Amino acid sequence: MHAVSVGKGSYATEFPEIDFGGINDPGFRDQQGEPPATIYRSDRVTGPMQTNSWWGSLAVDRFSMNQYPHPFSVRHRAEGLHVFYDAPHNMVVHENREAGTWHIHGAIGTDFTIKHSGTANFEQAVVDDYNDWYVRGLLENGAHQMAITYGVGSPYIFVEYEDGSAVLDFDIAPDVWEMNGHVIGFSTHDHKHYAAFAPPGQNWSGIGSKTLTNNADYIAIAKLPEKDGNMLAKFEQYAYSVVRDAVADWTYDEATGTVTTTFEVTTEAKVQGAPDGTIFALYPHQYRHLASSSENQLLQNYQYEIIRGTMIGLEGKRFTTELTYPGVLPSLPDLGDYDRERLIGYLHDATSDYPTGSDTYELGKYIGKLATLAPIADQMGEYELAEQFRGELKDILEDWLQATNASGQLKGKNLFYYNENWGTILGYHAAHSSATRINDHHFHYGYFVKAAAEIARADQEWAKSENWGGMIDLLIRDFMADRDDDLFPYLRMFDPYSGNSWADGLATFDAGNNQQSSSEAMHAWTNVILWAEATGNKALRDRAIYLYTTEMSAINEYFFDVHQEIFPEEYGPEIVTINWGGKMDHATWWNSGKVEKYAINWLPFHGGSLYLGHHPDYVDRAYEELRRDIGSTDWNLWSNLVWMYRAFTNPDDALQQMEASIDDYGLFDPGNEKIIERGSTKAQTYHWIHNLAELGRVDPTVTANHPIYAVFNKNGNRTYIVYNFSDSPITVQFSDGHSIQVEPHSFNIGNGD
Ligand SMILES: OC[C@H]1O[C@@H](O[C@@H]2[C@@H](O)[C@H](O[C@@H]3[C@@H](O)[C@@H](O)O[C@H](CO)[C@H]3O)O[C@H](CO)[C@H]2O)[C@H](O)[C@@H](O)[C@@H]1O
Ligand SMILES: OC[C@H]1O[C@@H](O[C@@H]2[C@@H](O)[C@H](O[C@@H]3[C@@H](O)[C@H](O)O[C@H](CO)[C@H]3O)O[C@H](CO)[C@H]2O)[C@H](O)[C@@H](O)[C@@H]1O
Ligand SMILES: OC[C@H]1O[C@@H](O[C@@H]2[C@@H](O)[C@H](O)O[C@H](CO)[C@H]2O)[C@H](O)[C@@H](O)[C@@H]1O
């Protein structure tokens, strides 16, 4: 009737009568709602609706907000599609010294508007189709229709007309520098270079005026890299091949660690003989990893400058990238030179901790904290305390994973609900617009998966599908479903082409979609790898490995700029805190200080965090910049996160800072995150830093033929760590020739007591 049973748990199918707990705060109350009733999609788009996309504002707004199908920005309006390109004169880097914020951004301008001869009063723009990274937006006014196909990594906009023909409208007359009749090369008054293409014999008119017209029912627009007729001729070749399908298919080679992704389009010919293929514009995280076999397809001098650096052109039907999955762990092992009694004391101290809210995010942080403590307790021989932590995790998850109370009625809080309209699992209490905007499901549900993965590491029975595993796998499907999932869209959070997750479900911003905590995305992927390994689910594990590895490639480019090629020279910070489709900010979604604008992309620290240490010059450079700005090691907030980060390259320094201040305050205090961030503990901090002191640096040059491992290197001496989730012993082969044997349900070394 009102809930669906899933193993021992359930989800609500009717919106619950929310228990507000006597809280009258309007913000809190408004959070306990649902996503928008109205979805702007045609009747060609059925089933669970895609969210968390670069193009989402087209689905949520009557028209759209500003979008970034790089190299373009575009926006839908009643009058047609505005097209823009941020040239260097449009780009700015601004600093607000007192706020401690920086902003790299362009403009919301219009180079020209793509229009329909029959109307400039479209009623709405709807999603008419989409694939892994393109969208087809349909401007509708009865018989008059204009379908616009566009995407990230597409230097083409394809335009299909019903009951009318093409118009390009400009505020200032453009320079048409090449007139081939049906094909034109033109520049805006401010020297931005474009081209337009119509079928042979359909010639452009209005050359020299503010309005270019064509009788065709099909045109394409290209952004040209240069004012270059040879480039124009190359763009002609693919200007009539409209992208209909686009898939990012991947494989994980467990033996080598290689994650291979092939990006393939299928096009439809708009003139006789049009090739099946396109010109792709690749982002840095793609071309820096281009497969050998795709190199011949590069159009070497075809570059575009965008917010994310330089895009490069590549021609054909497909291209491939190759990445290396580095492994993850369920926890750091027991390899530190800590005082064991001191660590045991901190473990017991952590029993004072409690969640600082009732919503999925604050409860999430708390269960992540307990799940992080439990293996450390096992290591210290405190098995009863470890069991206390896991029992608390079980109590919390067995509550939240049930939608009904003892009487069989729907609960008013601590439950999950399936919104059928969009097709998404929502948790109440909600926060950060997790329900009202479908935000952050990876960030929040990642913590639930962490808790489940830690339970599963000790208790396989609990994790079985007919027990509590079914509900955990439901939460995972919400945020990273495979294809053809009856309840959820494909890989909700992830944008396979941009290479990162997008946190906002709706994308109703003029900067496109955004992601702030890339580390909470990586945490979600890590926990799915662990959960799936523990529960013997290879297909799920491998999908999470693909996500972890691809997301890592985008983080190192766009959040860290480890290669020092992307951020403008005049940008002061050594991190971008929030990445948007159209801009980059050193700023947070809440009013914060200096440390948080770095550390929100580090936290939480867990056994999947070692990707943060692959680039030690970056770790040094970022730390030194933060230290310069603070002016000392007196961190304004979250000191322990800074010490843990510093330990990636200088554990002696991290240790001395930790010794000086870790015991400044006593037990858990929600009002005071100066020393310990509220999702962290003294026990975790002390265990992490001492482990890194003994282990040395992350060594990403060594891979393994199983997925749950790490390799460290201290002055040339390697330490190899494997956790074995199997009932059987395993042998692990490393890429440097090292080979180890691991007993069931154990680390190879540092199991502790
Ligand atoms: O210290 C008290 C102080 O804490 C602030 O809580 C912040 C969260 O606002 C912050 O939320 C992040 C989001 O902006 C986004 O990246 O997604 C998730 C949430 O879904 C979070 O990463 O997270 C940090 C780290 O956990 C918290 O410290 C409160 O906002 C603020 O009012 C309060 O004064
Ligand atoms: O987009 C993903 C991101 O969303 C964050 O929530 C933001 C809200 O913080 C923001 O709140 C607005 C304020 O910034 C402004 O000062 O006032 C208005 C009017 O009250 C507020 O609505 O609103 C946007 C939507 O416009 C939300 O997306 C979440 O905190 C963050 O977790 C999430 O990743
Ligand atoms: O960019 C991070 C900051 O986002 C701010 O919200 C902005 C909105 O007010 C505006 O309307 O949209 C843009 C994107 O087009 C947003 O940047 C928040 O107010 C800040 O707290 C946050 O740092």
PDB file of C-alpha atoms in Angstrom, residues 354-589:
ATOM      1  CA  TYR A 354      26.932  12.166  18.827  1.00  0.00           C
ATOM      2  CA  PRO A 355      25.363  13.357  15.569  1.00  0.00           C
ATOM      3  CA  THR A 356      24.873  17.138  15.315  1.00  0.00           C
ATOM      4  CA  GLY A 357      21.560  16.900  13.413  1.00  0.00           C
ATOM      5  CA  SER A 358      18.830  14.446  12.416  1.00  0.00           C
ATOM      6  CA  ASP A 359      19.217  14.845   8.644  1.00  0.00           C
ATOM      7  CA  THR A 360      20.921  12.369   6.300  1.00  0.00           C
ATOM      8  CA  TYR A 361      24.100  14.478   6.095  1.00  0.00           C
ATOM      9  CA  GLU A 362      24.731  15.039   9.830  1.00  0.00           C
ATOM     10  CA  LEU A 363      23.717  11.472  10.644  1.00  0.00           C
ATOM     11  CA  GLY A 364      25.958  10.409   7.746  1.00  0.00           C
ATOM     12  CA  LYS A 365      28.995  12.182   9.200  1.00  0.00           C
ATOM     13  CA  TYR A 366      28.364  10.433  12.530  1.00  0.00           C
ATOM     14  CA  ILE A 367      28.056   6.911  11.089  1.00  0.00           C
ATOM     15  CA  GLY A 368      31.185   7.539   8.945  1.00  0.00           C
ATOM     16  CA  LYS A 369      32.978   8.471  12.169  1.00  0.00           C
ATOM     17  CA  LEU A 370      31.866   5.269  13.941  1.00  0.00           C
ATOM     18  CA  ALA A 371      32.724   3.151  10.908  1.00  0.00           C
ATOM     19  CA  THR A 372      36.208   4.739  10.865  1.00  0.00           C
ATOM     20  CA  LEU A 373      36.743   3.993  14.596  1.00  0.00           C
ATOM     21  CA  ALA A 374      35.673   0.321  14.517  1.00  0.00           C
ATOM     22  CA  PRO A 375      38.693  -1.156  12.582  1.00  0.00           C
ATOM     23  CA  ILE A 376      41.074   0.945  14.740  1.00  0.00           C
ATOM     24  CA  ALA A 377      39.436  -0.572  17.881  1.00  0.00           C
ATOM     25  CA  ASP A 378      39.857  -4.078  16.339  1.00  0.00           C
ATOM     26  CA  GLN A 379      43.529  -3.277  15.719  1.00  0.00           C
ATOM     27  CA  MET A 380      44.100  -2.141  19.309  1.00  0.00           C
ATOM     28  CA  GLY A 381      42.542  -5.374  20.638  1.00  0.00           C
ATOM     29  CA  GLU A 382      39.474  -3.474  21.823  1.00  0.00           C
ATOM     30  CA  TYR A 383      37.094  -5.922  20.126  1.00  0.00           C
ATOM     31  CA  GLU A 384      34.195  -5.250  22.522  1.00  0.00           C
ATOM     32  CA  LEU A 385      34.433  -1.492  21.782  1.00  0.00           C
ATOM     33  CA  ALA A 386      34.641  -2.239  18.026  1.00  0.00           C
ATOM     34  CA  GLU A 387      31.474  -4.295  18.452  1.00  0.00           C
ATOM     35  CA  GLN A 388      29.827  -1.415  20.322  1.00  0.00           C
ATOM     36  CA  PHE A 389      30.563   0.864  17.349  1.00  0.00           C
ATOM     37  CA  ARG A 390      29.291  -1.672  14.784  1.00  0.00           C
ATOM     38  CA  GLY A 391      26.188  -2.354  16.917  1.00  0.00           C
ATOM     39  CA  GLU A 392      25.461   1.382  16.946  1.00  0.00           C
ATOM     40  CA  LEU A 393      25.857   1.384  13.132  1.00  0.00           C
ATOM     41  CA  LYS A 394      23.468  -1.565  12.870  1.00  0.00           C
ATOM     42  CA  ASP A 395      20.899   0.143  15.145  1.00  0.00           C
ATOM     43  CA  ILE A 396      20.981   3.333  13.055  1.00  0.00           C
ATOM     44  CA  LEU A 397      20.836   1.581   9.667  1.00  0.00           C
ATOM     45  CA  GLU A 398      18.105  -0.881  10.741  1.00  0.00           C
ATOM     46  CA  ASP A 399      16.055   2.184  11.739  1.00  0.00           C
ATOM     47  CA  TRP A 400      16.667   4.276   8.582  1.00  0.00           C
ATOM     48  CA  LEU A 401      16.336   1.326   6.185  1.00  0.00           C
ATOM     49  CA  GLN A 402      12.759   0.686   7.439  1.00  0.00           C
ATOM     50  CA  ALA A 403       9.995   2.991   6.319  1.00  0.00           C
ATOM     51  CA  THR A 404       7.323   1.684   8.683  1.00  0.00           C
ATOM     52  CA  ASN A 405       6.981   1.765  12.477  1.00  0.00           C
ATOM     53  CA  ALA A 406       5.996  -1.103  14.841  1.00  0.00           C
ATOM     54  CA  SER A 407       2.310  -0.573  13.935  1.00  0.00           C
ATOM     55  CA  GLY A 408       2.977  -0.757  10.186  1.00  0.00           C
ATOM     56  CA  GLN A 409       2.332   2.985   9.568  1.00  0.00           C
ATOM     57  CA  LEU A 410       4.833   5.158   7.652  1.00  0.00           C
ATOM     58  CA  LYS A 411       7.355   6.841   9.930  1.00  0.00           C
ATOM     59  CA  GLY A 412       7.663  10.656   9.994  1.00  0.00           C
ATOM     60  CA  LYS A 413      11.501  10.732  10.037  1.00  0.00           C
ATOM     61  CA  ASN A 414      14.532   8.413   9.667  1.00  0.00           C
ATOM     62  CA  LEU A 415      13.251   6.834   6.449  1.00  0.00           C
ATOM     63  CA  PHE A 416      13.642   6.704   2.685  1.00  0.00           C
ATOM     64  CA  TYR A 417      10.939   7.509   0.167  1.00  0.00           C
ATOM     65  CA  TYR A 418      10.745   6.912  -3.574  1.00  0.00           C
ATOM     66  CA  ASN A 419       9.678  10.045  -5.473  1.00  0.00           C
ATOM     67  CA  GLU A 420       8.057   8.508  -8.577  1.00  0.00           C
ATOM     68  CA  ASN A 421       7.773  11.795 -10.530  1.00  0.00           C
ATOM     69  CA  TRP A 422      11.553  12.071 -11.026  1.00  0.00           C
ATOM     70  CA  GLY A 423      12.443   8.537  -9.858  1.00  0.00           C
ATOM     71  CA  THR A 424      14.746   9.049  -6.881  1.00  0.00           C
ATOM     72  CA  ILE A 425      15.161   7.821  -3.278  1.00  0.00           C
ATOM     73  CA  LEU A 426      14.881  10.748  -0.844  1.00  0.00           C
ATOM     74  CA  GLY A 427      15.797  10.529   2.860  1.00  0.00           C
ATOM     75  CA  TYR A 428      13.980  12.425   5.635  1.00  0.00           C
ATOM     76  CA  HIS A 429      15.076  14.386   7.497  1.00  0.00           C
ATOM     77  CA  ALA A 430      16.722  16.063   4.516  1.00  0.00           C
ATOM     78  CA  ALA A 431      19.291  18.912   4.359  1.00  0.00           C
ATOM     79  CA  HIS A 432      21.367  20.754   1.727  1.00  0.00           C
ATOM     80  CA  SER A 433      18.321  20.368  -0.572  1.00  0.00           C
ATOM     81  CA  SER A 434      18.947  16.607  -0.834  1.00  0.00           C
ATOM     82  CA  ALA A 435      15.164  16.235  -1.234  1.00  0.00           C
ATOM     83  CA  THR A 436      13.919  19.542  -2.670  1.00  0.00           C
ATOM     84  CA  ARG A 437      16.662  19.818  -5.298  1.00  0.00           C
ATOM     85  CA  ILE A 438      17.809  16.135  -5.471  1.00  0.00           C
ATOM     86  CA  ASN A 439      21.235  17.347  -4.274  1.00  0.00           C
ATOM     87  CA  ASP A 440      24.244  15.517  -2.923  1.00  0.00           C
ATOM     88  CA  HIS A 441      22.972  11.899  -2.921  1.00  0.00           C
ATOM     89  CA  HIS A 442      26.522  10.606  -3.380  1.00  0.00           C
ATOM     90  CA  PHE A 443      27.782  12.805  -0.500  1.00  0.00           C
ATOM     91  CA  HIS A 444      25.025  11.735   1.915  1.00  0.00           C
ATOM     92  CA  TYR A 445      24.381   8.119   0.886  1.00  0.00           C
ATOM     93  CA  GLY A 446      28.150   7.541   0.655  1.00  0.00           C
ATOM     94  CA  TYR A 447      28.216   7.647   4.480  1.00  0.00           C
ATOM     95  CA  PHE A 448      25.377   5.113   4.744  1.00  0.00           C
ATOM     96  CA  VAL A 449      27.345   2.815   2.415  1.00  0.00           C
ATOM     97  CA  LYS A 450      30.483   3.316   4.581  1.00  0.00           C
ATOM     98  CA  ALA A 451      28.550   2.158   7.652  1.00  0.00           C
ATOM     99  CA  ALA A 452      27.180  -0.867   5.738  1.00  0.00           C
ATOM    100  CA  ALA A 453      30.629  -1.770   4.324  1.00  0.00           C
ATOM    101  CA  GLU A 454      32.161  -1.752   7.829  1.00  0.00           C
ATOM    102  CA  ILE A 455      29.297  -3.942   9.132  1.00  0.00           C
ATOM    103  CA  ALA A 456      29.781  -6.276   6.130  1.00  0.00           C
ATOM    104  CA  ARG A 457      33.537  -6.541   6.822  1.00  0.00           C
ATOM    105  CA  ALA A 458      32.653  -8.177  10.168  1.00  0.00           C
ATOM    106  CA  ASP A 459      29.216  -9.694   9.428  1.00  0.00           C
ATOM    107  CA  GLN A 460      28.415 -11.035   5.960  1.00  0.00           C
ATOM    108  CA  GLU A 461      24.983 -12.287   7.097  1.00  0.00           C
ATOM    109  CA  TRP A 462      23.674  -8.777   7.927  1.00  0.00           C
ATOM    110  CA  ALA A 463      24.744  -7.624   4.429  1.00  0.00           C
ATOM    111  CA  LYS A 464      22.857 -10.350   2.491  1.00  0.00           C
ATOM    112  CA  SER A 465      20.205  -9.004   0.088  1.00  0.00           C
ATOM    113  CA  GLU A 466      17.285 -10.650   1.969  1.00  0.00           C
ATOM    114  CA  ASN A 467      18.545  -8.992   5.150  1.00  0.00           C
ATOM    115  CA  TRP A 468      19.784  -5.372   5.085  1.00  0.00           C
ATOM    116  CA  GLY A 469      21.813  -5.540   1.862  1.00  0.00           C
ATOM    117  CA  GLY A 470      18.816  -5.007  -0.401  1.00  0.00           C
ATOM    118  CA  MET A 471      18.149  -1.528   0.996  1.00  0.00           C
ATOM    119  CA  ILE A 472      21.839  -0.591   0.814  1.00  0.00           C
ATOM    120  CA  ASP A 473      21.915  -1.695  -2.833  1.00  0.00           C
ATOM    121  CA  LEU A 474      18.778   0.439  -3.420  1.00  0.00           C
ATOM    122  CA  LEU A 475      20.546   3.563  -2.061  1.00  0.00           C
ATOM    123  CA  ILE A 476      23.543   2.777  -4.297  1.00  0.00           C
ATOM    124  CA  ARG A 477      21.299   2.388  -7.355  1.00  0.00           C
ATOM    125  CA  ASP A 478      19.796   5.778  -6.649  1.00  0.00           C
ATOM    126  CA  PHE A 479      23.127   7.544  -6.999  1.00  0.00           C
ATOM    127  CA  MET A 480      25.004   5.299  -9.471  1.00  0.00           C
ATOM    128  CA  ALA A 481      22.561   3.006 -11.294  1.00  0.00           C
ATOM    129  CA  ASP A 482      23.614   0.885 -14.245  1.00  0.00           C
ATOM    130  CA  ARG A 483      21.758   1.158 -17.584  1.00  0.00           C
ATOM    131  CA  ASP A 484      18.091   0.060 -17.830  1.00  0.00           C
ATOM    132  CA  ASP A 485      17.386   0.408 -14.109  1.00  0.00           C
ATOM    133  CA  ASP A 486      13.578   0.436 -13.705  1.00  0.00           C
ATOM    134  CA  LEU A 487      13.693   2.957 -10.837  1.00  0.00           C
ATOM    135  CA  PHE A 488      16.642   5.264 -11.505  1.00  0.00           C
ATOM    136  CA  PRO A 489      18.436   7.121 -14.324  1.00  0.00           C
ATOM    137  CA  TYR A 490      21.902   5.998 -15.466  1.00  0.00           C
ATOM    138  CA  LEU A 491      24.808   6.935 -13.115  1.00  0.00           C
ATOM    139  CA  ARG A 492      22.808   9.797 -11.621  1.00  0.00           C
ATOM    140  CA  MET A 493      25.655  11.827 -10.132  1.00  0.00           C
ATOM    141  CA  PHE A 494      28.267  11.287 -12.781  1.00  0.00           C
ATOM    142  CA  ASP A 495      29.015  13.135 -16.004  1.00  0.00           C
ATOM    143  CA  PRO A 496      31.117  10.582 -17.946  1.00  0.00           C
ATOM    144  CA  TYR A 497      32.487  13.224 -20.356  1.00  0.00           C
ATOM    145  CA  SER A 498      33.210  16.137 -17.982  1.00  0.00           C
ATOM    146  CA  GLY A 499      34.792  13.414 -15.800  1.00  0.00           C
ATOM    147  CA  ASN A 500      33.257  14.486 -12.471  1.00  0.00           C
ATOM    148  CA  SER A 501      30.040  14.257 -10.492  1.00  0.00           C
ATOM    149  CA  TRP A 502      27.636  17.206 -10.315  1.00  0.00           C
ATOM    150  CA  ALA A 503      26.125  17.823  -6.900  1.00  0.00           C
ATOM    151  CA  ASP A 504      22.990  19.829  -7.741  1.00  0.00           C
ATOM    152  CA  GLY A 505      20.001  17.756  -8.937  1.00  0.00           C
ATOM    153  CA  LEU A 506      18.379  20.678 -10.807  1.00  0.00           C
ATOM    154  CA  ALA A 507      21.324  22.775 -12.189  1.00  0.00           C
ATOM    155  CA  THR A 508      19.247  25.983 -12.076  1.00  0.00           C
ATOM    156  CA  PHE A 509      22.194  28.360 -12.011  1.00  0.00           C
ATOM    157  CA  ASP A 510      23.676  30.544 -14.728  1.00  0.00           C
ATOM    158  CA  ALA A 511      27.071  28.922 -14.046  1.00  0.00           C
ATOM    159  CA  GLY A 512      25.639  25.459 -14.936  1.00  0.00           C
ATOM    160  CA  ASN A 513      25.971  22.633 -12.403  1.00  0.00           C
ATOM    161  CA  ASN A 514      28.555  22.572  -9.565  1.00  0.00           C
ATOM    162  CA  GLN A 515      30.509  20.268  -7.251  1.00  0.00           C
ATOM    163  CA  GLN A 516      32.162  21.405  -4.047  1.00  0.00           C
ATOM    164  CA  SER A 517      33.305  18.366  -2.033  1.00  0.00           C
ATOM    165  CA  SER A 518      35.078  16.180  -4.612  1.00  0.00           C
ATOM    166  CA  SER A 519      36.444  14.182  -1.671  1.00  0.00           C
ATOM    167  CA  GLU A 520      32.907  13.233  -0.502  1.00  0.00           C
ATOM    168  CA  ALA A 521      32.274  12.010  -4.089  1.00  0.00           C
ATOM    169  CA  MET A 522      35.475   9.930  -3.911  1.00  0.00           C
ATOM    170  CA  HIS A 523      34.351   8.661  -0.472  1.00  0.00           C
ATOM    171  CA  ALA A 524      31.046   7.463  -1.971  1.00  0.00           C
ATOM    172  CA  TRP A 525      32.864   5.603  -4.757  1.00  0.00           C
ATOM    173  CA  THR A 526      35.344   4.081  -2.289  1.00  0.00           C
ATOM    174  CA  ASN A 527      32.539   2.763  -0.108  1.00  0.00           C
ATOM    175  CA  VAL A 528      30.715   1.167  -3.007  1.00  0.00           C
ATOM    176  CA  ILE A 529      34.010  -0.585  -3.975  1.00  0.00           C
ATOM    177  CA  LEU A 530      34.299  -1.863  -0.357  1.00  0.00           C
ATOM    178  CA  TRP A 531      30.625  -2.838  -0.022  1.00  0.00           C
ATOM    179  CA  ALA A 532      30.608  -4.617  -3.368  1.00  0.00           C
ATOM    180  CA  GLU A 533      33.869  -6.431  -2.599  1.00  0.00           C
ATOM    181  CA  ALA A 534      32.510  -7.547   0.805  1.00  0.00           C
ATOM    182  CA  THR A 535      29.214  -8.769  -0.715  1.00  0.00           C
ATOM    183  CA  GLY A 536      30.726 -10.487  -3.784  1.00  0.00           C
ATOM    184  CA  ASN A 537      29.147  -8.112  -6.340  1.00  0.00           C
ATOM    185  CA  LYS A 538      31.759  -7.826  -9.128  1.00  0.00           C
ATOM    186  CA  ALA A 539      29.680  -5.734 -11.593  1.00  0.00           C
ATOM    187  CA  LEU A 540      28.859  -3.114  -8.906  1.00  0.00           C
ATOM    188  CA  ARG A 541      32.469  -3.073  -7.647  1.00  0.00           C
ATOM    189  CA  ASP A 542      33.855  -2.494 -11.136  1.00  0.00           C
ATOM    190  CA  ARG A 543      31.411   0.352 -11.838  1.00  0.00           C
ATOM    191  CA  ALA A 544      32.534   2.054  -8.635  1.00  0.00           C
ATOM    192  CA  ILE A 545      36.197   1.491  -9.646  1.00  0.00           C
ATOM    193  CA  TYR A 546      35.452   3.206 -12.991  1.00  0.00           C
ATOM    194  CA  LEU A 547      33.876   6.140 -11.097  1.00  0.00           C
ATOM    195  CA  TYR A 548      36.673   6.418  -8.522  1.00  0.00           C
ATOM    196  CA  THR A 549      39.351   6.365 -11.206  1.00  0.00           C
ATOM    197  CA  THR A 550      37.691   8.798 -13.616  1.00  0.00           C
ATOM    198  CA  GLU A 551      36.664  11.207 -10.860  1.00  0.00           C
ATOM    199  CA  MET A 552      40.294  11.159  -9.651  1.00  0.00           C
ATOM    200  CA  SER A 553      41.480  12.307 -13.124  1.00  0.00           C
ATOM    201  CA  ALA A 554      39.086  15.267 -13.089  1.00  0.00           C
ATOM    202  CA  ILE A 555      39.975  16.230  -9.483  1.00  0.00           C
ATOM    203  CA  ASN A 556      43.688  16.422 -10.244  1.00  0.00           C
ATOM    204  CA  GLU A 557      42.999  18.726 -13.212  1.00  0.00           C
ATOM    205  CA  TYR A 558      40.141  21.025 -12.168  1.00  0.00           C
ATOM    206  CA  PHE A 559      40.239  21.127  -8.380  1.00  0.00           C
ATOM    207  CA  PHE A 560      44.001  20.819  -7.871  1.00  0.00           C
ATOM    208  CA  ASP A 561      45.537  21.753 -11.274  1.00  0.00           C
ATOM    209  CA  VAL A 562      48.453  19.466 -10.352  1.00  0.00           C
ATOM    210  CA  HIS A 563      50.082  20.121 -13.783  1.00  0.00           C
ATOM    211  CA  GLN A 564      49.943  23.957 -13.296  1.00  0.00           C
ATOM    212  CA  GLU A 565      48.355  24.488 -16.702  1.00  0.00           C
ATOM    213  CA  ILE A 566      44.717  25.346 -16.006  1.00  0.00           C
ATOM    214  CA  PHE A 567      44.332  28.010 -13.314  1.00  0.00           C
ATOM    215  CA  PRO A 568      45.262  31.531 -14.485  1.00  0.00           C
ATOM    216  CA  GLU A 569      48.723  32.652 -13.270  1.00  0.00           C
ATOM    217  CA  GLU A 570      47.136  35.547 -11.345  1.00  0.00           C
ATOM    218  CA  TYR A 571      44.832  33.184  -9.385  1.00  0.00           C
ATOM    219  CA  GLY A 572      46.395  33.128  -5.897  1.00  0.00           C
ATOM    220  CA  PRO A 573      45.080  29.946  -4.278  1.00  0.00           C
ATOM    221  CA  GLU A 574      46.366  26.427  -4.922  1.00  0.00           C
ATOM    222  CA  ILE A 575      42.883  24.884  -5.078  1.00  0.00           C
ATOM    223  CA  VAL A 576      39.532  25.568  -6.669  1.00  0.00           C
ATOM    224  CA  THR A 577      36.915  24.794  -4.007  1.00  0.00           C
ATOM    225  CA  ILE A 578      33.786  24.762  -6.211  1.00  0.00           C
ATOM    226  CA  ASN A 579      33.886  23.736  -9.852  1.00  0.00           C
ATOM    227  CA  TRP A 580      31.035  24.940 -12.025  1.00  0.00           C
ATOM    228  CA  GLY A 581      30.206  24.374 -15.701  1.00  0.00           C
ATOM    229  CA  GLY A 582      31.189  28.007 -16.337  1.00  0.00           C
ATOM    230  CA  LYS A 583      33.389  29.273 -13.520  1.00  0.00           C
ATOM    231  CA  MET A 584      35.693  28.296 -10.649  1.00  0.00           C
ATOM    232  CA  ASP A 585      35.497  29.580  -7.072  1.00  0.00           C
ATOM    233  CA  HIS A 586      37.714  29.608  -4.027  1.00  0.00           C
ATOM    234  CA  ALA A 587      34.613  29.887  -1.824  1.00  0.00           C
ATOM    235  CA  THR A 588      32.200  27.607   0.025  1.00  0.00           C
ATOM    236  CA  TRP A 589      28.478  26.976   0.073  1.00  0.00           C
TER     237      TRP A 589
END
